[PDB]
Structure formats: C-alpha cells, structure tokens
RNA sequence: AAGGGCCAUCGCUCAACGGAUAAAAGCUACCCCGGGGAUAACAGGCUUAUCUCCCCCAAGAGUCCACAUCGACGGGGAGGU
RNA sequence: CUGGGGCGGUCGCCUCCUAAAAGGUAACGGAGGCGCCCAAAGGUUCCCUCAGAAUGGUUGGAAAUCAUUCGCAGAGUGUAAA
RNA sequence: GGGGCCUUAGCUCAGGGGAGAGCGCCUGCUUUGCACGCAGGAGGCAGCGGUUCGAUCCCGCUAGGCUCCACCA
C-alpha cells in the first residue's frame, strides 16, 4: 500500500484523463512489460495486488519495475450526509493513467512466464491492457 | 556507635584545635550535611556536620567533598549570622547525643554579638538548630517540626528554644543498687540507667562475664580519653566505636583520629549501601524470571506426559503397510505379528480401507512428532534462559559495581529492562604474571575474544557455572596453571567449595556460539579448590 | 483561602483529611470564633488550635499553593502556647 | 454674550464590520392569521454511494487436487425491495 | 446565510488557486493571513552584495567567529501569500 | 457524529529562553528518643507535522478521556 510520505495539499481536484500519456510509453528498464489501452485511476491496493500476484507466480523472478506511483489523493465524504459543508476527507491514494502508458515491467524471466504474470495482474486491474516488449 | 561517650570525646578533642576558630567559609554540600572551612590555631580545617538520620554525626575531614553550586536557604542563613565567626567554646549538652557551639561574630554594624549553635543527633530525628544566647530564641532550623507530633519541644524560628526531655538516667555499682540483676538481658536496660549508650556497647560490656567493674573501668577510660578509635567488621556489618571490639569475631582496623575513622567509614557507606539496594532490587527480578522459567518448564514437562502415542502409530502403520493384502475394507480389528514375534490386535475404522487407516496412523505419528518437537524446543529455550540467569546470579553474587553497570545494560539489551573500552580486571599471579578476568559476561567475552590470541589458554570452571579468566597469552608454568584454578574456584557457582575442578583449554578451541553460551574443547581439567585474597 | 488547604500547605497538618477531621471536631477556632475547614482565611488572621490539651495561637502572614517544604513555615508565625 | 458655522482633531470590535434604536433574552404541545410545494416528514421520480444478487482472475483451504464445495488481496456488472 | 429548519460554522479586509492565457466571475470550494509595526525598519547622499558547501585551523563541539576558492541568488526583502 | 475542556514524574500541580515543586505505595536501611526519617522502585510535555535560533508554552492534523448536544414531523 504505497504512500507519498509528504504532500503540500491533502485535497486536490480530481482532474481529467484526456489524451495519451506523456512518457513511460515503452519498456526500457525491463524486457517484457504491460501497457494500458484506456484511462483510469488506479489505487495502491490494486497495484500491490498485481505486484504480489506476479511475484507469487514468479517466486524468484528477476525484477519488476512498476512505473507509477499513486501521488494523487482522493476524498470521500462520510456516509449518509447531505451535500456541502466543506470538502470530504481524504480516503486513499491514486495514480492517474493515460493510455499508451506502461505500468509494470519484467526482466530476468522468459516471455511466457512474463505474459502469464502480466495476465494475472491485468485481471486484478480494471482496465484493458496489452503485452509489450522492448525494441 | 555515636553514643554520648563518643560525643563527649569529640567535644574536648575538637576544642583542642578550634578554640576561637574563625569561621572562614560555610557551605551545604548535601541536604542534611554542612561544611565549615574554619581557620583556627593558625590553620584552615574542615568541619562536617550531619543531621542525616542514620549517618547523622559531626566530623572533620581531609576530604572537603564538594561545595555546592547552589547556596541553599539554610546555608545562606548561616552565612547571615555566623560567617566570619569565632568559636569561643564547645559543650557536650550533659553527655546526651547533643552538642553546643558558643560562637561570637560582629553584626552588620560591627557590634559584637553571640549565638548558640545546637546539634542534636538523636538518630532518625536528629536536627541542627541555631539559637540566641540570652533570649534562647531559635533563629534558624534545618528540620522544622510543628507540634502536630504533640511533642514537648519545637523547632521553628522566633520561638524560645527548648531541649528534649532528658530521661531519668544517671549519665555516667549503682546498677547493682537500682537494677535487679536477676532481670536478665541487661544490655537492654543499661540504656534505662545511663545516658550515652549503644546496644552495641551494652552487649559488648555485658558479655564480659555482676559486672559493675566493666562499666566503671570503661567510663574511666572514656573520661581519660583512653579509647582506641577503630572500625570493627563482624562478617560485614561494619561497626565502630571509641572502645575496640570486646568479644566478637569481627576484624578490626585502628586509627589515630576518630575523625579519620568517621571519614573511612562514611566515605564508602554513603553509596555502597545504595549500590547494594540496587543490586538486591535487580537480583529479586532476575530470580523471579529464573524461577518463572523453571516452573514454566515444569508445566511443559508434566503436560508432555499425556500425549506420547507416536511410536505405537508408527509401528501400526508399518505393520498395516506390511499386511495390506490380507485386510478387508470393512473390519474392526487385525491380529498382526511384529517383525520377539508378538501378535498385536490393531483396531480399525470399519468404514475405511486399510490404506486409509494406516495413513491415518502415520498422520497421528506425524502430529505427535510435531507437537513433541515443539515442546522440546520450548524446553531448550527455557533451559538456556535458566542457565543464563543462573550464571548471571553467580556473577551478581561475585560482582563488583563496575560489572553490575554492564550487566544492567546487557539485560536492557535483552529487553528484560529499560534505561567505552574498560573491559578487564586483574591482579598478581604466579611467575610474576598478570591474570585478567571479568565478572561480567560481556566483559569476559570481550577479553576472551579481543584481548588474546587463539593459541593462548583460557581457564574457567570444569563445571556448571563460573567466571572466565586468563593471562595475556596464558602459557606460563604449572605454578600459574594452578594459581588460575584458585581464581576460578573463588568466583564460581559455589565459592569456598573445596572440590571445584577447573578446565584449562587453548583459546583456539573457545566456542563463540544466548550470550556466554561458550563451549570449549582442546581442554584438560584439574581438581582444585577456592582460596583467599592471596589469589590476587 | 480555605483552612484545610492552608494547614496542608503550611505543613501544620500533613493531610487535608486530618485538617477536615479536626475542624469538624471543632477542636480549633479563628479570632475567638469556632471555625470549619471551609472557613476563609487571609493574612493577619489570628488562629487558635488544639492538639489534645496543647492549645496554640498563631498568626497568618501569607498564603499560597505551590508551597515547597521550608518555604511553608514562612507563611505564618507562632505566637503562643497554652494547655 | 450664550450658542452656532468653517478649519484641524478626539471619542464605536456599531465584529451581524454600508452600521435599523443610546437602550433589549426565551417557551408555546393551549395557539392564531397570511403564504408556499419558491422549502422539510410519507409515497412517487433521477441517481444507486449504501443494500441485495450475479460474475471475472485465482492464490490458497480442500490429505494429494484451484474450480465437489469454499474463495483471500483485487476487479466488473444487474436490480431498484 | 443555510442543498428544509434548528444546533454547529461564518458575517468586514488582504494574498493565491479554482479563473477556462485581458479584466471580471460563484459555492457551508481549497490554503493562509489583518484589526499592526519602525522616530528608525522613513527621506537623501555615499558605500557593497547574500545563503550554503569543501579545506585549514584552541575553547570550537555537526553547527559560532575565522581566512580560504566554489559560488544569479538556494539568502534577504518588519509581517501571510503572490 | 458535532462543539468545548483536558491528556507533563507512580499521583496532583506549575512553568515561548531549556520541565521542576509537593505527595504517596512496595522494598531496603535505620535507630535510646514523644508517630519527627533516608535511598531505590523512577522521576518524564498523548502522538504527527509546521513557524522560530527555540516550542510544553504559537499554529495545524489525528488519537484517548470528561462534560454538553445529537430536535420537528
């Protein structure tokens, strides 16, 4: 459950996930990676689920290199409450994702193993994905 | 110790020096303790006073201990009315444990004035008071005492001073007159006739066996200042008095000055007893833990005696796998032979197959095996801890404060407790050699590892628990080999045990495997015994 | 302040409980008047007290609450004792 | 002359800060009038966070065996009680 | 005022974001400040340039002050922010 | 859940410039003396963050506790 240690503002606007990514569109730390085909917010619980999934499938395998970090916080008012009276309290932390963006990489491991692990992770994630490799 | 006799001796023997002593400086180092640097007889001298209840006394010390950074209220009040004083006279207060200084000094206008400083040393309720000469009014007081104690006298300033009720005791045959010697335990009731008495003095005089002679002779002795200031030590419990020891087995060390006697007594006892309190408070806790671990393993052992059906199930599974062809699925029993050719009737589950049943027996064997392994590991843990604490208590018995300070940190590191090169201690040895040791486990390990080589020799117990000690590259003669055995037997699980074998082994085989779980090989062993301080 | 608090801080009596007890017995008084633990006091007050037969008369100079030990007795002065 | 005017200046958390008076708190279930669906309680409606139900990946439990039956961390939907 | 009212909270002024590249722009939207201070902390003339880092060096110490080269600026700008 | 108060040694307390006053329980010492003591159990700002050369002392966020409120259909 990743966390930014320190932040300026505990409360931010949400934002808009228009367009494609700026960077991180291609694997370069590792060999076999995964990228997105949509745009969405992703949570520390999602990423750690995917991470531990692939690492359990691999059991010693090489290196991973996540390519993101949930910097963004997201609020949520308490339950059964009218509107207004200030912005809701923070709940967790979020990473924002554009399409064309690489999320997880892999090295030290064969292609079939990598593809299967990333499949497993994709099923923990909400969005549509693609298997990718380095050029 | 501090009887009216000792008091009266001091009264004359300090007026010997401090006729008209010019009080040059005043300080209050500790709570119930006050220092005067006085100039009398053309010389500067120290004068300690103490109303500290058990240690309340008066003294003159070569050790000007420490003048404080803070001048307290009482000190400054003394500075107000006594500073630059002049000790006209000393008085004994009629042989009670009380003293008087008749003092002169000029006031703030240069007009000469006088005062009466009183020092009542009663024991738990001693005190120091300052009083006016003519008015007898108290001006200062160290232990203000309000009459909620509904007592005769009172301390507070301004009030007319008053002395305690002097008891109806003839302060100096008269006991054979007044007291019925049939009463017995008369060491008690000499206090009931005389003023300056200790039960120590009374007992030592009563043990002279009708003995008025002893009383009269000793009174003449004191009156003549014929005493001998020594300190007595009856197996510890170090006592002292004007007279020497009379009968008891205790050691004696004599002095030229009662003041030096007081110095060499109290200079240690100020903190020795504190260290003893700390040591005992810690020892209680350690013994609680060790006793707890012992009872813990007792629980585990007496619990272990009720789940031990492993081998039966093992052998049953063996036999069933051996006889897995004569057996129906649905049967209750099996007359079966062991591979000594007995014939065992093993029960079955009439629903299961023999395969299932035998596998269940193997399963139960596995389970009992597992649980027993668990309990045996817990046993090993607890016994390691118990032996650790037993060695620890041995060390604490044979300890010094310098190693106790390390042991505390060792245990706080072990997290049983909560809140840098000096390692070893040595003395003389045979062949003019030096043999180093450490009563602390940590210091002992530091010496064994970092202070010697592998080919050197370590000498320790050939037995359960003792210290660890050796000379730097211990390769000296058999004289030193046998001398190390004495140092080993001295600091051991059983000090003064005249049958203790010591193990001497090359440091190259010293096993550095809890802490101080050091095994040893390349070892020989020699029966030996404890010794005296000549082991130093 | 209150009498019992005053007695404790001045260390005449070691326990406020005991101060209350004696005031409820009425063994003591103020300015010739019988008093109680809640009785108000001030500087200049003249206080009569009993300890069995020991009767006492004192005078109030000051009053506070932090009252360290030796500074307690500065708070007041003895005047007289009877029995 | 009193007094007033002009000029300069002082006096207000008048703070509810364009300040209603120099001067002011509450109960009403004993209540009343004028109006409102411009605004609340029921129901209806939109939403479906929540709720219920279904499903995906599948580690793991299941002696062995993921999917007999259960199903973690996570994910996606339906319904409109 | 009020996402019914009540209770809570707020009520004037300043700075930023929201604010959509002039300006302006709401919400019980997000962050913070004011109800002053200086008689020199003003005016003018003249002067010079910071913070930190590395070296060496008593007390001096990780950290005073010291010389020392590096050093658009990481400092300062009475106070909050721009 | 909201608001206010509090959260400093074992207990009770004071105190933006360096946390210190008193008291008690258990143990030990202790002794001639009308409960008159001493040492150790031990003496540590609920936590997090920020401003300042500095924070218990100013600010903010959160936890624990006490009190008040949590009403109309």
Swiss-Prot record, chain A:
GO function term, MF aspect, one: tRNA binding
Coiled-coil positions: none
UniProt KW keywords: Ribonucleoprotein, Ribosomal protein, RNA-binding, rRNA-binding, tRNA-binding
PROSITE patterns: RIBOSOMAL_L16_1, RIBOSOMAL_L16_2
One GO cellular component, as annotated: cytosolic large ribosomal subunit
Superkingdom assignment: Bacteria
Family annotation (Pfam families): Ribosomal_L16
Signal sequence, start to end: none
GO biological processes: translation
UniProt cross-references to InterPro entries, sorted A to Z: Ribosomal_uL16, Ribosomal_uL16_bact-type, Ribosomal_uL16_CS, Ribosomal_uL16_dom, Ribosomal_uL16_sf
Matches recorded under PANTHER family: 50S/60S RIBOSOMAL PROTEIN L16 (PTHR12220), LARGE RIBOSOMAL SUBUNIT PROTEIN UL16M (PTHR12220:SF13)
Subunit-structure text: Part of the 50S ribosomal subunit.
Reported function: Binds 23S rRNA and is also seen to make contacts with the A and possibly P site tRNAs.
Family affiliation: Belongs to the universal ribosomal protein uL16 family.
Name by which UniProt lists this protein: Large ribosomal subunit protein uL16
Organism: Bacillus subtilis (strain 168)
UniProtKB/Swiss-Prot annotation, chain B:
Domain of life of the native organism: Bacteria
HAMAP family for this protein: RqcH_B
Gene Ontology biological process terms in this record: rescue of stalled ribosome
Entry's induction text: Up-regulated under secretion stress conditions, possibly in a CssR/CssS-dependent manner.
Region (NFACT-R): 420-536
Domain-related comment: Has 4 domains; N-terminal NFACT-N, central helix-hairpin-helix (HhH), 2 coiled coil domains with a beta-hairpin in the middle (CC-M), and C-terminal NFACT-R. The NFACT-N domain contacts 23S rRNA, the A/P-site tRNA anticodon and recognizes tRNA(Ala), while the M beta hairpin binds protein uL11 near the base of the bL12 stalk.
HhH domain: annotated span: 173-269
Similarity-based family: Belongs to the NEMF family.
Residue ranges that the Swiss-Prot or TrEMBL entry lists as coiled coil: 267-324, 353-415
Chain's role: Key component of the ribosome quality control system (RQC), a ribosome-associated complex that mediates the extraction of incompletely synthesized nascent chains from stalled ribosomes and their subsequent degradation. RqcH recruits Ala-charged tRNA, and with RqcP directs the elongation of stalled nascent chains on 50S ribosomal subunits, leading to non-templated C-terminal alanine extensions (Ala tail). The Ala tail promotes nascent chain degradation. RqcH, RqcP and charged tRNA(Ala) are necessary and sufficient to add an Ala tail to a model stalled nascent peptide; does not add Val.
Any further remark recorded for this protein: Activity of this protein is best tested in a clpP or ssrA deletion mutant; ssrA (tmRNA) encodes the SsrA tag added to nascent proteins in stalled ribosomes by trans-translation, which targets the nascent protein for degradation.
Record region (Coiled-coil-M (CCM)): 270-419
Sorted UniProt keywords: Coiled coil, Protein biosynthesis, RNA-binding, rRNA-binding, tRNA-binding
Region entry NFACT-N domain, spans: 1-172
Keyword Nucleotide-binding: no
GO MF annotations in UniProt: ribosomal large subunit binding; rRNA binding; tRNA binding
Protein name listed in UniProt: Rqc2 homolog RqcH
GO cellular component: RQC complex
Pfam families found in the cross-reference section: NFACT-R_1, NFACT_N
From Swiss-Prot, chain C:
Family: Belongs to the RqcP family.
Note: Activity of this protein is best tested in a clpP or ssrA deletion mutant; ssrA (tmRNA) encodes the SsrA tag added to nascent proteins in stalled ribosomes by trans-translation, which targets the nascent protein for degradation.
Changes seen on gene knockout: Not essential; synthetic growth defects can be seen in double rqcP-ssrA mutants. Double rqcH-rqcP deletion strains grow normally in rich media. Loss of Ala tailing, RqcH is still recruited to the 50S ribosomal subunit. In vivo mild decrease in tRNA(Ala)-binding by RqcH.
Task performed by this protein: Key component of the ribosome quality control system (RQC), a ribosome-associated complex that mediates the extraction of incompletely synthesized nascent chains from stalled ribosomes and their subsequent degradation. RqcH recruits Ala-charged tRNA, and with RqcP directs the elongation of stalled nascent chains on 50S ribosomal subunits, leading to non-templated C-terminal alanine extensions (Ala tail). The Ala tail promotes nascent chain degradation. RqcP is associated with the translocation-like movement of the peptidyl-tRNA from the A-site into the P-site.
Domain S4 RNA-binding: 1-62
Phenotype upon changing residue 16 to A: Synthetic growth defect with ssrA deletion, loss of interaction with 50S subunit, loss of Ala tailing in vitro
GO biological process: rescue of stalled ribosome
Key word NADP present: no
Gene that this sequence comes from: rqcP
Protein name per UniProt: RQC P-site tRNA stabilizing factor
CDD domains according to UniProt: S4 (cd00165)
One annotated GO molecular function: tRNA binding
InterPro entries xrefs: RqcP, S4_RNA-bd, S4_RNA-bd_sf
HAMAP family with a match to the protein in the record: RqcP
Keyword Nucleotide-binding: no
Domain of life: Bacteria
GO cellular component terms listed in the entry, alphabetical order: RQC complex
Keywords: Protein biosynthesis, RNA-binding, rRNA-binding, tRNA-binding
């Amino acid at each position: 459950m990743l966390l930014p240690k320190r932040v300026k503002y505990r409360r931010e606007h949400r934002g808009k996930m228009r367009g494609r990514a700026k960077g991180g569109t291609e694997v370069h730390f590792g060999e076999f990676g995964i990228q997105a085909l949509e745009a969405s917010w992703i949570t520390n619980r999602q990423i750690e689920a995917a991470r531990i999934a692939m690492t359990r499938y691999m059991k010693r395998g090489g290196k991973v290199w996540i390519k993101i970090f949930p910097s963004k916080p997201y609020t949520a008012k308490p339950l059964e409450v009218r509107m207004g009276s200030g912005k809701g309290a923070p709940e967790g932390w979020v990473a924002v994702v554009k399409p064309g963006k690489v999320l997880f990489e892999i090295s030290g491991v064969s292609e079939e193993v990598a593809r299967e692990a990333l499949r497993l992770a994709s099923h923990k994630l909400p969005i549509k994905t693609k298997f990718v490799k380095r050029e | 110790s501090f009887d009216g006799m000792f008091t009266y001796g001091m009264t004359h023997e300090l007026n010997e020096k401090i006729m008209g002593g010019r009080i040059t400086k005043i300080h209050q180092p500790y709570k119930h303790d006050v220092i005067f640097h006085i100039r009398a007889k053309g010389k500067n001298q120290k004068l300690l006073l103490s109303a500290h209840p058990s240690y309340s006394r008066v003294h003159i010390t070569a050790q000007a201990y420490e003048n404080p950074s803070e001048p307290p209220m009482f000190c400054m009040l003394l500075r107000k009315h006594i500073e630059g004083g002049f000790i006209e006279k000393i008085e004994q207060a009629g042989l009670d444990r009380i003293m008087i200084f008749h003092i002169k000094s000029r006031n703030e206008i240069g007009d000469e004035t006088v005062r009466k400083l009183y020092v009542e040393i009663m024991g738990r309720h001693s005190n120091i008071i300052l009083t006016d000469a003519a008015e007898n009014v108290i001006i200062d007081g160290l232990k203000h005492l309000s009459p909620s104690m509904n007592s005769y006298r009172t301390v507070l300033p301004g009030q007319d001073y008053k002395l305690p009720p002097a008891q109806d005791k003839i302060s100096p045959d008269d006991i054979l007159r007044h007291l019925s010697f049939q009463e017995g335990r008369l060491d008690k009731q000499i206090v009931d006739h005389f003023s300056g008495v200790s039960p120590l003095f009374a007992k030592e005089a009563v043990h002279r066996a009708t003995l008025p002679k002893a009383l009269l002779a000793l009174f003449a002795e004191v009156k003549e200042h014929r005493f001998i200031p020594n300190i007595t030590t009856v197996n510890g419990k170090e006592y002292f008095y004007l007279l020497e020891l009379t009968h008891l087995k205790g050691e004696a060390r004599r002095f030229d000055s009662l003041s030096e006697l007081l110095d060499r007594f109290y200079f240690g006892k100020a903190e020795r007893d504190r260290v003893k309190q700390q040591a005992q408070d810690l020892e209680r806790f350690v013994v609680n833990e060790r006793k707890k671990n012992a009872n813990k393993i007792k629980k585990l052992e007496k619990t272990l005696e009720y789940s031990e059906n492993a081998k039966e199930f093992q052998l049953y599974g063996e036999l069933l796998t051996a006889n897995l062809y004569m057996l129906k699925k649905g049967d209750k029993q099996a007359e079966v032979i062991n591979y000594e050719s007995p014939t065992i009737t093993i029960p079955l589950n009439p629903n299961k197959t023999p395969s299932e049943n035998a596998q269940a027996y193997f399963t139960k064997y596995q389970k009992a095996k597992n649980s027993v392994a668990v309990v045996e590991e817990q046993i090993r843990l607890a016994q390691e801890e118990i032996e650790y604490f037993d060695q620890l208590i041995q060390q604490l018995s044979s300890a010094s404060p310098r190693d106790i300070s390390e042991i505390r940190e060792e245990l706080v590191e072990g997290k049983y407790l909560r809140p840098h090169n000096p390692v070893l201690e040595t003395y003389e040895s045979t062949s003019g050699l030096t043999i180093l040791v450490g009563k602390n486990n940590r210091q002992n390990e530091y010496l064994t590892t970092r202070v010697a080589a592998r080919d050197d020799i370590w000498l320790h117990t050939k037995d359960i628990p003792g210290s660890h000690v050796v000379i730097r590259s211990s390769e000296p003669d058999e004289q030193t080999i046998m001398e190390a055995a004495t140092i080993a037997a001295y600091f051991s699980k059983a000090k003064d045990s005249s049958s203790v074998p010591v193990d001497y082994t090359k440091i190259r085989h010293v096993k550095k495997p809890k802490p101080g779980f050091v095994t040893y090989d390349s070892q020989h062993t020699v029966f030996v015994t404890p010794d005296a301080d000549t082991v130093i | 302040m209150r009498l019992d608090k005053f007695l404790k801080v001045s260390r005449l009596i070691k326990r406020r409980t005991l101060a209350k007890e004696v005031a409820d017995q009425g063994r003591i008084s103020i300015n010739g008047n019988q008093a109680k633990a809640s009785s108000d006091v001030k500087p200049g007050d003249e206080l009569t007290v009993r300890f069995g037969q020991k009767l006492v008369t004192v005078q109030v100079n000051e009053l506070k609450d932090t009252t360290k030990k030796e500074e307690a007795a500065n708070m007041y002065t003895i005047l007289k004792e009877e029995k």
